[PDB]
A paper describes a structure:
Its structure was refined to 2.40 Å resolution. There are two molecules in the asymmetric unit of crystal form S and eight molecules in that of form L. The enzyme appears to exist as a homodimer in both crystal forms. Since the SGSH structure was determined in two crystal forms, S and L, we could use the ten crystallographically independent monomers of SGSH to assess the structural flexibility of the enzyme under two different crystallization conditions. To investigate the mobility at the dimer interface, all five homodimers were superimposed based on one of the subunits in each dimer. The relative orientation of the dimer subunits in the L form differs from that in the S form by 2.6–3.0°, indicating that the dimer interface is slightly flexible, possibly owing to crystal packing. However, the dimer interface is slightly flexible, displaying a rotation of up to 3.0° in the two crystal forms.
Mucopolysaccharidosis type IIIA (MPS IIIA) is caused by the functional defect of N-sulfoglucosamine sulfohydrolase (SGSH; also known as sulfamidase, sulfamate sulfohydrolase and heparan N-sulfatase; EC 3.10.1.1) and represents one of the most frequent lysosomal storage diseases worldwide. SGSH belongs to the sulfatase family and catalyses the cleavage of N-linked sulfate groups from the GAGs heparan sulfate and heparin. Despite the low sequence identity between this unique N-sulfatase and the group of O-sulfatases, they share a similar overall fold and active-site architecture, including a catalytic formylglycine, a divalent metal-binding site and a sulfate-binding site.
Residue numbers in the entry:
A (entry chain A): 22 to 505
B (entry chain B): 22 to 502
Amino acid sequence: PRNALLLLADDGGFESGAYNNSAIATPHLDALARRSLLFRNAFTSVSSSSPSRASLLTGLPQHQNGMYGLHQDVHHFNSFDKVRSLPLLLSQAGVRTGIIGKKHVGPETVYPFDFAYTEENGSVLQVGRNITRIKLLVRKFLQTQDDRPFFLYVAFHDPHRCGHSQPQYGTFCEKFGNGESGMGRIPDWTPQAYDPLDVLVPYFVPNTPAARADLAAQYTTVGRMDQGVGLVLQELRDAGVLNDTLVIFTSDNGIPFPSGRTNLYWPGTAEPLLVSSPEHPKRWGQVSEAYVSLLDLTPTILDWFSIPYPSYAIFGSKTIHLTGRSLLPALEAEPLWATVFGSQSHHEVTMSYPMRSVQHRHFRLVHNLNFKMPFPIDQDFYVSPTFQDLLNRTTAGQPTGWYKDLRHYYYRARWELYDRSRDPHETQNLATDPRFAQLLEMLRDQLAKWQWETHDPWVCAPDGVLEEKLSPQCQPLHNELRSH
Amino acid sequence: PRNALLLLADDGGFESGAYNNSAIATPHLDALARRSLLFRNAFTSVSSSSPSRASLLTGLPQHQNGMYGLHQDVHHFNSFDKVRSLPLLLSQAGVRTGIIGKKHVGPETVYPFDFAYTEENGSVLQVGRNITRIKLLVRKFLQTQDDRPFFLYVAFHDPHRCGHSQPQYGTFCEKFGNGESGMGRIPDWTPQAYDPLDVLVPYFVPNTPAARADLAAQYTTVGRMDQGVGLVLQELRDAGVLNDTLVIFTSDNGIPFPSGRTNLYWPGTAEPLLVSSPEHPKRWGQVSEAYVSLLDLTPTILDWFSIPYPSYAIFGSKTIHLTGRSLLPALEAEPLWATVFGSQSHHEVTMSYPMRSVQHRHFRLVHNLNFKMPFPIDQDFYVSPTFQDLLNRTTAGQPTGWYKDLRHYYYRARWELYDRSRDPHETQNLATDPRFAQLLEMLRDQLAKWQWETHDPWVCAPDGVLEEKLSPQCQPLHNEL
Ligand SMILES: *[C@@H]1O[C@H](CO)[C@@H](O[C@@H]2O[C@H](CO)[C@@H](O)[C@H](O)[C@H]2NC(C)=O)[C@H](O)[C@H]1NC(C)=O
Ligand SMILES: *[C@@H]1O[C@H](CO)[C@@H](O[C@@H]2O[C@H](CO)[C@@H](O)[C@H](O)[C@H]2NC(C)=O)[C@H](O)[C@H]1NC(C)=O
Ligand SMILES: *[C@@H]1O[C@H](CO)[C@@H](O[C@@H]2O[C@H](CO)[C@@H](O)[C@H](O)[C@H]2NC(C)=O)[C@H](O)[C@H]1NC(C)=O
Ligand SMILES: *[C@@H]1O[C@H](CO)[C@@H](O[C@@H]2O[C@H](CO)[C@@H](O)[C@H](O)[C@H]2NC(C)=O)[C@H](O)[C@H]1NC(C)=O
Ligand SMILES: *[C@@H]1O[C@H](CO)[C@@H](O[C@@H]2O[C@H](CO)[C@@H](O)[C@H](O)[C@H]2NC(C)=O)[C@H](O)[C@H]1NC(C)=O
Ligand SMILES: *[C@@H]1O[C@H](CO)[C@@H](O)[C@H](O)[C@H]1NC(C)=O
Ligand SMILES: *[C@@H]1O[C@H](CO)[C@@H](O)[C@H](O)[C@H]1NC(C)=O
Ligand SMILES: [Ca+2]
Ligand SMILES: [Ca+2]
Ligand SMILES: [Cl-]
């Protein structure tokens, strides 16, 4: 019987030897990468936890599945009842499903799991960061197997920040379980300290002491996550099912720094992705240049279990189809896929800054629907040392060491067009350059077509109103905003 | 045994003889007004259907109960599970609950009804506009009563527009059931035609042929709603329970015209309100000047049944308390209440234009949190003849006959302060006038206090971020605001 394992890092980036970061040690991820096809050009469709996890587990963009923003307490976003998620479809096909760690999506009927240990019935600290607890839960899952195939979803909470919720464990909870007084112990974890002067400062992160300290703490926590991956894989090896299991590792969104999480800039949507098939080792240890999306995961896993996507509608007769594709074929031969999309509406319920993006190879186009208002900052990131430092220096009128300034971070153009082959930092907007008018129109057309195809309620915003029963379906408001 | 009846109009305004409109005939509402206390200064806290209905049925502002916007299909907003609504509390106290018409709120567990005929299990056209069907459902409700008190919620869908959904019935569905071909027949309804030249054109509605036609159609439909009220009251009278029943009539938000629905301007939140207590007829046929809110209805009805609001929390240990008050005391003697609040976030999910308001007597202060972006227009109103006409004339550069222009309707000041005793049209913003700096700060303080008191997640927006463990709790973003 075929099995599947989805390892999901929380706010994880490219901090690994597998992705050529020699400043950090991630031997277990590196080991996995040698048995995997590594993707250099993978992206999430949305840079917000719940929406990203909902899209990943449905194959549908947030504006289609209904997770327009964060799921918990006051934010309270849920996917539509009639949505058919991966786990649901797997269960109906006779596959045993399990989740360990951060779920952060609902409702339960849409995202059901036979075996569940999450924040809903326990501590996300334990089942998300305590890799020993995680390892034992994986062991229990495998011991209680019953001849059915399985799908195991391990959603680490590492390397997510902790500064807002639990500061006593460090900015990235890098102190939790380290053995020191009040921290407790995680027997299977060997803490890895990092010097702030040795960490790699990403181009979009301010080069300041405060930021480097943040990164050092992050590195330590990523190491814990790395060791967690090692333990999990070892449990399958001990149960004798690893060689029958498709393993996938990735992250839900960009790292929690400026221009990262919550942005549709490269840093906010670019994600690590490893795919290891025991049946297709031809391209083990290789790197793929194909442009892929987390919207491809549901299709990939369905393909793995030979389960077809059913024909159904959420509203009316509007039949639902996936825009992603199975990545399995890439495990045999390199494809030429070059296009990926992005869609984000809310993060927190108070943060309404819808963005839509399309990327064709190195060209990225972002549409900021509420561009005239300032880009909103979430409550957790606001208190990060990195942002506090940036805010402090900006307010004092002193050099920030940042590749942008807050003014331009807050107030953006409606359309942002970048060529990352020339301008990887995405600082040279080409949208108003007449030499790129034809390319702009092409990308706009591709984006709009995808929006209609995926029933985006925001498809006419902000210059127009959606009127389905007439033509054109987007009717103009004449609100001093251009239309297309 | 005491009963209560809540009659709720959808997008209803002051089109009635009771409110001194001589151009329309509303004999049944006028009759009700003679047996009730009429409120000249009643307001909804939010000018959007689901949020308004959730707030009305909970006593909590939309930003607290969780209905941030519309409830249906793609908009998909629901109140928090732990919210304790009026109907829930009544049920737990042994009161039989019933709803007939448009519900437009959820989830069911939060808003449960023993007897329910709504859009969720039938046609909103029938149970919302077909007053004969409504009358028979009321009859059925009363015939199946036991020795329990009852609370009956009749949510008319009239006089809501129909232009977007069902244009064949007219702009306001004023043709539905009129007898003509394809319209069907409503035996208990006597259609009332109106000349577009005779209707009263509200100050905030463009004086154009297209708008007057809209109003004429509205008047006809309001008449149907009026006759529906008559039938309902008559059913209680036939069951011999009217004299044991507290009757309340009002509307969920302002009329569907410019500056009305979806706005926190006077036209968008001002609502008609009649309260008839068979035990306190002292002030029957009188007019009250007290400033009241639909947030007062839940407290009022709870008071009527002698049911206390329980002590509980939705999140954490932050206990929930109502900011509204029972209106019952006003039925005996005129009070001095002068303050009312407003809070609106979304309408449609794609319409994010949060507004917060406070009104002290004739002074109204509105805060537009997303002011730099244009005011969004909903899909239903966009295709209205009134707006289409306005848009058309504006685009052609011709006179609109409107007291505003679209540019200023779309792009508003962050703070709008109006004195309606001098400027009822609300066109002279005083917020930037130094003469009103002290008053401005006072109203801002009242507004903010209410926001914190009601756990508003938008309390720091847009210039700051909420950090509860820090001081001040609103931390600055320095985002040019
Ligand atoms: C890490 O760096 C190595 C060495 O520079 C990269 O391997 C090279 O990849 C490119 C092909 O696009 C060429 O420089 C050579 O064909 C490769 N050289 C070797 C020695 O393998 C590799 O691509 C990088 N790894 C990742 C994940 O980006
Ligand atoms: C991580 O989880 C492990 C196992 O779930 C915890 O170790 C257990 O701790 C309990 C009480 O704290 C002991 O009674 C058990 O004997 C331990 N079991 C094992 C297998 O070690 C550990 O406390 C957790 N670490 C932290 C920092 O919370
Ligand atoms: C692990 O899985 C692989 C793939 O299924 C097994 O290798 C296959 O073995 C079969 C015979 O049983 C051959 O016909 C195939 O050609 C093999 N495929 C590949 C890709 O090598 C392997 O035997 C399994 N067991 C171990 C210990 O690796
Ligand atoms: C309908 O119109 C009448 C007459 O204008 C209003 O009654 C007047 O109210 C004002 C202000 O309260 C008093 O100063 C006058 O003495 C009243 N005149 C009369 C003849 O009664 C009445 O308030 C209006 N009704 C409504 C509901 O607005
Ligand atoms: C209608 O209801 C009122 C009030 O419930 C009745 O009048 C009350 O009668 C009770 C006892 O019969 C007295 O204690 C109250 O003082 C009365 N209230 C008032 C305001 O008069 C009245 O009898 C009822 N009418 C009918 C026909 O039954
Ligand atoms: C920012 O400034 C505040 C107040 O001046 C200070 O207390 C804090 O330490 C500073 N934080 C950072 C990260 O620089
Ligand atoms: C607005 O203009 C369009 C196109 O000229 C026209 O067809 C339509 O009838 C106009 N709408 C109104 C309400 O006059
Ligand atoms: Ca995340
Ligand atoms: Ca309404
Ligand atoms: Cl909830």
